[PDB]
């Protein structure tokens, strides 16, 4: 019914250049790979996330999937505990989510 998630943002400014996009996507994809191979996601957020909750491991707590931005909710369809989703692009950059738990 509800999911517990954490988030990481690899930032991009408005109207980013190709060089900026390629760098951010590369870093985001590498973080996804690390997270899918056992790296502590909260510590990856502490080290790399630009979002305001980075120091708290990007924790989002528990919630209902459809209340999140559609780009997140859609990507979380049928996701299982431990899944890493992303990179997901939006105007602010590349997003990565970890499904910490489900209940």
């Amino acid at each position: 019914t509800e999911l517990n998630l954490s988030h990481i943002l690899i930032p991009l400014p408005e109207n980013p250049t190709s060089d900026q996009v390629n760098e951010a996507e590369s870093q985001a994809r590498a973080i996804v790979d690390q997270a899918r191979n056992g790296a502590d996601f909260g510590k990856l957020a502490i080290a790399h996330s630009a979002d305001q909750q980075a120091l708290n491991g990007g924790q989002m707590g528990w919630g209902r999937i459809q209340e999140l931005p559609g780009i997140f909710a859609q990507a979380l369809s049928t996701a299982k505990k431990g899944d890493i989703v992303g990179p997901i692009r939006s105007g602010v950059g590349f997003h990565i989510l970890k499904v910490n738990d489900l209940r």
């Binding site: 979002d51 990007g58 989002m60 999140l68």
Partner: peptide, 7 residues
């Protein structure tokens, strides 16, 4: 949700 990032 306790926190929802901006997109």
């Amino acid at each position: 949700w306790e926190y929802i990032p901006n997109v």
